[PDB]
């Protein structure tokens, strides 16, 4: 506006700007509009830039102006030229083809008035206060009013101030599916950038509020948990009075029953608290009074609400026993649980019992370490209960694709899956993009229609009536798609085709770091701009303007195998797959589109490709990064009496599946068979070999690893043999289980990552005092594990481990009271017999000769500090060990 | 009935209950003299048509049908050299793409092959010491998915 406002080659301004002609290109839209904004003061510098324009010289300003023509304000006067439309479809054109200009005219008319002020715009503009409205204007009423009249910055806001309800009123036919869209446009922009601003975003929210009487009970769940922001202090409490005035509302309305709302307010709240300790009173009625709606199962949201005020208690439940009311679905409601576990509450302690698995251990083990920052009681209370867990214990949609001509349609089927779940929202534009995406399309679909053009095919499959349900109403408009994303445009005719073989599938070093992040992305981009060649209405733009988004890989598979229906065959980087010396991902993504490209040729619907492609050699690539596959690409192109010793290394990267036994062994070397029989099961002859190899060499050839003898002895049952065969000698690296086998400890502590046999020797051997307080010290011991499984050095055996940790507390936990001792024995022997049902009775062991030590120590360190106790740790020891004999000759 | 018995005895040793090694069975009560019984085994065919489709369009199939056929009544044994290691030149086997063309999902194949492999050789033990005979082709039964071989009614 500034340079508009001058007449001295202003345009000159552009030069820092764009620290040429093209800085003005840049934005030309936007120019466009200043000219027809600037009215009064149009000129020959906005005809200079007409000049240059084509069509646009007329059109844009009949088009794209309308985008935001009304934004500008420039007068009542200037708004009746543009309703005059000298060059446009009267009012239909700036109408019905703009609603979403309205977007643009509020962002412009963002008066963020002082709530003092706002309040008496409200009066006028949401007169009468009605329910929800009064709830609304309450919460503005209980602010301090600290708005910058400043904000209005460029200022047509100021301008707007109330006016703004008069232009307001221009519209007609309010609905949901308008409101809908404006929140979640809103939503995201406001989601990013400086906080500076936000309280521009939370008076813009309240205004959408106050404008809509759409408030359809059920249907508001999104609303309530799309906007569990609370980012900032001040964010929150923003949000908290706009959240308890929808609270209050919820409660006016005497309705919107709505359950699966809760996880997504308690787990923000919980969080907000920590550190934060600190809540509105308006909200805490907002959401106390709740209490007695009764619509919800209220057992588990009853002890978060008495968590959050007082007396969190429920030591009798909340604190272990408590059904896992996150044992269904959410994925992430179980933040909630685990704060809530480590929020007051209690130690965890005296077995709890809570005999639920099912879903609880599926979902605990399903998108898994959630706990980024929760710890204390939680992490007690899962361990106790890994035993319970424990005990628990694609090619169709392919095949139907690869059953098509062009079909294309099936994206769509992917896409709607994708936008109505995925993340569940995960608090990004990606829901937006796709929702905007999805809206587009369904209006094509079943409004202009027509050819079917694979669009009409979401109404056959009946997709359309869930995706249009908020959707494909005011919006088609691809005019309306390219303001919303400068996307469908120019990014695919960069993307090229050639510039991918030139770039994104270019050895490329430079997109190392762009890599699946980004290099992955220009590929497909690539795909879709060449697709577009002859690509389907709304399809080649959706595509393109998904292509800033995240993870949306599959789509990729689908767009490249329509691309290729071309006689063409570029191929390409197919020839030459095999540099990939810069970044891992790439390659990755190059042999899934290696392997759907075969599953084509089984179909045999046009194979030439597959054909064409370099077999083998690209093989070694597939093996570095060790895919299952690499038998199939090897024996296929095999199948005959030639061996190859590749073969040998791909039998090794799988260790053995009782597979190497078969290779074609029979040396010409006597004695070389040695090499073999070393390696796999034997638990006698092997041993043999191995000490006959020795005995024949050791001589001086003092280099043979002694490794294939020492586990041999081991596994034969020699202890007493290995920690004289290798001492100090490089030699594995779990000479601890020796070390606790037998009775010599002394080989410091494993502070660095404990696995098994290391765990269950750190936990004794650090452990100081006789009894008192070394049980605490024992507790501690057992967190300091599980911060070591989540390292998670060896998949299933830190849950085993953990569990090994438990089973030494609780009895090492009661030298007080030794009443119940004997019984707390008699559990844990009948749990371990039930444990050994499964997996052989050979890791175990060292689980209950570490539980037989433990108790050695407790009554070697004790005395008569201890009175009695002792008497019974050594009895237990003895009986113990006479379990141990019987199980181990029993299975071992 | 004998073979629910044998497998009863296949499990409880922990090695090979740990391998998922055992044997599919039936229940299949007869209905007096004419019985017809049921358990027909979901997701499965026959080998034989298995075997149809893959060799439809190599060499001859009735061919073969009719070389152990004119082969029975000659002199001694002979036809092993005449004919029988001559038709053996035939396609050479093509059982292997029944897997590849059904399973292209690495992971499952891999262990789809694992059970077809495990599964043979508890067939062929059990069947060796009970002493049976038959199966004739026919009453050899593939199952897809997992790939496990399974018996119908042996007599």
Same mark, same amino acid.
């Given at each position: 506006?500034?340079?508009?406002?001058?007449?001295?080659?202003?345009?000159?301004?552009?030069?820092?700007?764009?620290?040429?002609?093209?800085?003005?290109?840049?934005?030309?839209?936007?120019?466009?509009?200043?000219?027809?904004?600037?009215?009064?003061?149009?000129?020959?510098?906005?005809?200079?830039?007409?000049?240059?324009?084509?069509?646009?010289?007329?059109?844009?300003?009949?088009?794209?102006?309308?985008?935001?023509?009304?934004?500008?304000?420039?007068?009542?006067?200037?708004?009746?030229?543009?309703?005059?439309?000298?060059?446009?479809?009267?009012?239909?054109?700036?109408?019905?083809?703009?609603?979403?200009?309205?977007?643009?005219?509020?962002?412009?008319?963002?008066?963020?008035?002082?709530?003092?002020?706002?309040?008496?715009?409200?009066?006028?503009?949401?007169?009468?206060?009605?329910?929800?409205?009064?709830?609304?204007?309450?919460?503005?009423?209980?602010?301090?009013?600290?708005?910058?009249?400043?904000?209005?910055?460029?200022?047509?806001?100021?301008?707007?101030?109330?006016?703004?309800?008069?232009?307001?009123?221009?519209?007609?036919?309010?609905?949901?599916?308008?409101?809908?869209?404006?929140?979640?446009?809103?939503?995201?922009?406001?989601?990013?950038?400086?906080?500076?601003?936000?309280?521009?975003?939370?008076?813009?929210?309240?205004?959408?509020?106050?404008?809509?009487?759409?408030?359809?009970?059920?249907?508001?769940?999104?609303?309530?948990?799309?906007?569990?922001?609370?980012?900032?202090?001040?964010?929150?409490?923003?949000?908290?009075?706009?959240?308890?005035?929808?609270?209050?509302?919820?409660?006016?309305?005497?309705?919107?029953?709505?359950?699966?709302?809760?996880?997504?307010?308690?787990?923000?709240?919980?969080?907000?608290?920590?550190?934060?300790?600190?809540?509105?009173?308006?909200?805490?009625?907002?959401?106390?009074?709740?209490?007695?709606?009764?619509?919800?199962?209220?057992?588990?949201?009853?002890?978060?609400?008495?968590?959050?005020?007082?007396?969190?208690?429920?030591?009798?439940?909340?604190?272990?026993?408590?059904?896992?009311?996150?044992?269904?679905?959410?994925?992430?409601?179980?933040?909630?649980?685990?704060?809530?576990?480590?929020? $007051?509450?209690?130690?965890?302690?005296?077995?709890?019992?809570?005999?639920?698995?099912?879903?609880?251990?599926?979902?605990?083990?399903?998108?898994?370490?959630?706990?980024?920052?929760?710890?204390?009681?939680?992490?007690?209370?899962?361990?106790?209960?890994?035993?319970?867990?424990?005990?628990?214990?694609?090619?169709?949609?392919?095949?139907?694709?690869?059953?098509?001509?062009?079909?294309?349609?099936?994206?769509?089927?992917?896409?709607?899956?994708?936008?109505?779940?995925?993340?569940?929202?995960?608090?990004?534009?990606? @829901?937006?993009?796709?929702?905007?995406?999805?809206?587009?399309?369904?209006?094509?679909?079943? /409004?202009?229609?027509?050819?079917?053009?694979?669009?009409?095919?979401?109404?056959?499959?009946?997709?359309?009536?869930?995706? $249009?349900?908020?959707?494909?109403?005011?919006?088609?408009?691809?005019?309306?798609?390219?303001?919303?994303?400068?996307?469908?445009?120019?990014?695919?005719?960069?993307?090229?085709?050639?510039?991918?073989?030139?770039?994104?599938?270019?050895?490329?070093?430079?997109?190392?770091?762009?890599?699946?992040?980004?290099?992955? !992305?220009?590929?497909?981009?690539?795909?879709?701009?060449?697709?577009?060649?002859?690509?389907?209405?709304?399809?080649?733009?959706?595509?393109?303007?998904?292509?800033?988004?995240?993870?949306?890989?599959?789509?990729?598979?689908?767009?490249?195998?329509?691309?290729?229906?071309?006689?063409?065959?570029?191929?390409?980087?197919?020839?030459?797959?095999?540099?990939?010396?810069?970044?891992? @991902?790439?390659?990755?993504?190059?042999?899934?589109?290696?392997?759907?490209?075969?599953?084509?040729?089984?179909?045999?619907?046009?194979?030439?490709?597959?054909?064409?492609?370099?077999?083998?050699?690209?093989?070694?690539?597939?093996?570095?990064?060790? /895919?299952?596959?690499?038998?199939?690409?090897?024996?296929?192109?095999?199948?005959?009496?030639?061996? !190859?010793?590749?073969?040998?290394?791909?039998?090794?990267?799988?260790?053995?599946?009782?597979?190497?036994? /078969?290779?074609?062994?029979?040396?010409?070397?006597? /004695?070389?068979?040695?090499?073999?029989?070393?390696?796999?099961?034997?638990?006698?002859?092997?041993?043999?070999?191995?000490?006959?190899?020795?005995?024949?060499?050791?001589?001086?050839?003092?280099?043979?690893?002694?490794?294939?003898?020492?586990?041999?002895?081991?596994?034969?049952?020699?202890?007493?043999?290995?920690?004289?065969?290798?001492?100090?000698?490089?030699?594995?690296?779990?000479?601890?289980?020796?070390?606790?086998?037998?009775?010599?400890?002394?080989?410091?502590?494993?502070?660095?990552?404990?696995?098994?046999?290391?765990?269950?020797?750190?936990?004794?051997?650090?452990?100081?005092?006789?009894?008192?307080?070394?049980?605490?010290?024992?507790?501690?011991?057992?967190?300091?594990? @599980?911060?070591?499984?989540?390292?998670?050095?060896?998949?299933?055996?830190?849950?085993?481990?953990?569990?090994?940790?438990?089973?030494?507390?609780?009895?090492?936990?009661?030298?007080?009271?030794?009443?119940?001792?004997?019984?707390?024995?008699?559990?844990?022997?009948?749990?371990?017999?039930?444990?050994?049902?499964?997996?052989?009775?050979?890791?175990?062991?060292?689980?209950?000769?570490?539980?037989?030590?433990?108790?050695?120590?407790?009554?070697?360190?004790?005395?008569?500090?201890?009175?009695?106790?002792?008497?019974?740790?050594?009895?237990?020891?003895?009986?113990?060990?006479?379990?141990?004999?019987?199980?181990?000759? $029993?299975?071992? | 009935?004998?073979?629910?018995?044998?497998?009863?005895?296949?499990?409880?040793?922990?090695?090979?209950?740990?391998?998922?090694?055992?044997?599919?069975?039936?229940?299949?009560?007869?209905?007096?003299?004419?019985?017809?019984?049921?358990?027909?085994?979901?997701?499965?065919?026959?080998?034989?048509?298995?075997?149809?489709?893959?060799?439809?369009?190599?060499?001859?199939?009735?061919?073969?049908?009719?070389?152990?056929?004119?082969?029975?009544?000659?002199?001694?044994?002979?036809?092993?050299?005449?004919?029988?290691?001559?038709?053996?030149?035939?396609?050479?086997?093509?059982?292997?793409?029944?897997?590849?063309?059904?399973?292209?999902?690495?992971?499952?194949?891999?262990?789809?092959?694992?059970?077809?492999?495990?599964?043979?050789?508890?067939?062929?033990?059990?069947?060796?010491?009970?002493?049976?005979?038959?199966?004739?082709?026919?009453?050899?039964?593939?199952?897809?998915?997992?790939?496990?071989?399974?018996?119908?009614?042996?007599?």
């Amino acid at each position: 506006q500034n340079l508009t406002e001058l007449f001295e080659y202003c345009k000159f301004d552009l030069i820092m700007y764009w620290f040429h002609e093209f800085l003005g290109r840049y934005f030309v839209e936007i120019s466009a509009i200043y000219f027809s904004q600037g009215f009064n003061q149009k000129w020959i510098l906005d005809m200079l830039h007409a000049i240059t324009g084509n069509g646009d010289a007329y059109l844009v300003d009949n088009s794209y102006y309308l985008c935001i023509p009304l934004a500008f304000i420039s007068g009542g006067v200037n708004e009746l030229i543009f309703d005059i439309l000298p060059q446009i479809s009267g009012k239909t054109t700036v109408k019905y083809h703009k609603k979403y200009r309205l977007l643009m005219l509020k962002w412009i008319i963002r008066f963020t008035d002082l709530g003092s002020l706002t309040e008496l715009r409200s009066t006028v503009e949401k007169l009468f206060p009605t329910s929800y409205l009064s709830p609304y204007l309450f919460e503005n009423s209980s602010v301090s009013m600290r708005y910058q009249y400043p904000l209005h910055i460029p200022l047509a806001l100021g301008a707007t101030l109330v006016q703004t309800q008069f232009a307001h009123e221009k519209n007609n036919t309010h609905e949901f599916k308008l409101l809908f869209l404006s929140v979640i446009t809103d939503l995201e922009k406001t989601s990013t950038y400086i906080g500076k601003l936000r309280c521009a975003r939370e008076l813009k929210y309240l205004f959408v509020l106050y404008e809509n009487v759409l408030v359809k009970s059920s249907t508001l769940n999104f609303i309530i948990i799309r906007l569990s922001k609370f980012l900032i202090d001040t964010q929150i409490h923003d949000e908290v009075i706009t959240i308890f005035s929808s609270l209050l509302n919820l409660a006016d309305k005497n309705t919107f029953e709505i359950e699966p709302s809760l996880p997504n307010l308690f787990c923000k709240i919980f969080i907000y608290l920590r550190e934060n300790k600190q809540l509105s009173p308006s909200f805490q009625q907002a959401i106390k009074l709740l209490e007695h709606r009764d619509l919800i199962k209220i057992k588990t949201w009853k002890y978060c609400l008495d968590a959050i005020f007082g007396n969190i208690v429920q030591d009798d439940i909340y604190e272990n026993t408590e059904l896992l009311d996150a044992s269904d679905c959410g994925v992430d409601d179980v933040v909630l649980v685990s704060l809530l576990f480590s929020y $007051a509450r209690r130690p965890v302690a005296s077995k709890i019992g809570c005999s639920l698995s099912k879903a609880a251990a599926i979902n605990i083990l399903k998108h898994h370490v959630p706990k980024e920052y929760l710890s204390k009681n939680f992490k007690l209370w899962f361990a106790a209960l890994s035993r319970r867990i424990l005990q628990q214990e694609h090619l169709k949609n392919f095949e139907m694709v690869f059953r098509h001509p062009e079909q294309p349609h099936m994206i769509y089927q992917r896409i709607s899956t994708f936008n109505k779940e995925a993340e569940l929202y995960d608090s990004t534009e990606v @829901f937006f993009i796709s929702e905007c995406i999805l809206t587009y399309l369904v209006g094509y679909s079943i /409004g202009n229609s027509e050819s079917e053009f694979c669009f009409r095919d979401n109404i056959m499959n009946e997709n359309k009536d869930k995706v $249009a349900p908020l959707d494909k109403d005011v919006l088609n408009a691809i005019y309306p798609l390219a303001n919303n994303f400068g996307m469908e445009s120019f990014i695919c005719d960069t993307y090229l085709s050639v510039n991918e073989p030139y770039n994104c599938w270019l050895s490329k070093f430079a997109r190392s770091l762009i890599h699946q992040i980004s290099f992955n !992305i220009p590929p497909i981009v690539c795909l879709y701009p060449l697709c577009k060649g002859s690509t389907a209405f709304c399809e080649l733009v959706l595509t393109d303007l998904f292509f800033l988004s995240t993870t949306y890989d599959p789509k990729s598979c689908l767009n490249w195998s329509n691309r290729i229906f071309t006689q063409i065959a570029m191929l390409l980087h197919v020839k030459d797959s095999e540099i990939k010396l810069k970044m891992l @991902f790439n390659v990755i993504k190059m042999i899934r589109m290696g392997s759907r490209c075969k599953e084509r040729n089984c179909l045999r619907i046009y194979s030439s490709l597959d054909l064409q492609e370099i077999c083998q050699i690209s093989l070694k690539i597939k093996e570095f990064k060790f /895919g299952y596959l690499l038998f199939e690409e090897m024996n296929m192109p095999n199948i005959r009496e030639m061996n !190859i010793n590749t073969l040998q290394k791909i039998y090794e990267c799988i260790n053995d599946g009782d597979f190497l036994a /078969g290779l074609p062994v029979p040396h010409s070397i006597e /004695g070389v068979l040695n090499s073999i029989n070393r390696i796999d099961s034997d638990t006698w002859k092997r041993f043999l070999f191995n000490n006959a190899d020795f005995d024949a060499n050791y001589t001086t050839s003092l280099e043979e690893e002694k490794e294939s003898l020492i586990k041999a002895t081991e596994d034969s049952g020699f202890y007493g043999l290995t920690s004289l065969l290798e001492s100090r000698l490089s030699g594995s690296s779990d000479v601890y289980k020796w070390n606790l086998e037998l009775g010599d400890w002394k080989l410091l502590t494993p502070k660095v990552v404990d696995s098994k046999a290391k765990g269950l020797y750190y936990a004794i051997k650090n452990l100081p005092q006789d009894v008192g307080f070394a049980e605490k010290s024992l507790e501690k011991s057992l967190l300091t594990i @599980f911060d070591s499984r989540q390292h998670f050095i060896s998949q299933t055996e830190w849950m085993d481990t953990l569990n090994a940790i438990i089973e030494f507390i609780k009895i090492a936990a009661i030298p007080q009271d030794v009443t119940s001792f004997p019984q707390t024995l008699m559990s844990i022997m009948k749990a371990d017999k039930e444990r050994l049902n499964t997996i052989d009775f050979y890791d175990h062991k060292t689980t209950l000769k570490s539980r037989h030590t433990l108790m050695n120590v407790l009554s070697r360190n004790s005395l008569d500090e201890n009175v009695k106790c002792s008497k019974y740790l050594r009895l237990g020891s003895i009986i113990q060990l006479a379990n141990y004999v019987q199980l181990a000759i $029993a299975n071992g | 009935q004998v073979f629910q018995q044998v497998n009863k005895v296949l499990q409880n040793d922990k090695v090979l209950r740990n391998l998922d090694l055992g044997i599919r069975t039936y229940k299949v009560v007869p209905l007096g003299p004419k019985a017809g019984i049921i358990e027909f085994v979901a997701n499965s065919t026959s080998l034989h048509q298995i075997l149809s489709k893959l060799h439809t369009n190599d060499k001859i199939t009735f061919d073969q049908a009719r070389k152990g056929m004119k082969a029975v009544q000659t002199k001694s044994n002979e036809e092993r050299l005449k004919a029988y290691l001559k038709i053996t030149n035939e396609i050479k086997p093509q059982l292997r793409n029944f897997f590849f063309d059904s399973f292209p999902d690495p992971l499952d194949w891999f262990e789809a092959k694992k059970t077809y492999t495990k599964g043979v050789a508890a067939s062929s033990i059990v069947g060796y010491i009970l002493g049976l005979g038959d199966r004739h082709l026919n009453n050899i039964l593939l199952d897809c998915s997992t790939g496990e071989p399974i018996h119908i009614d042996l007599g």
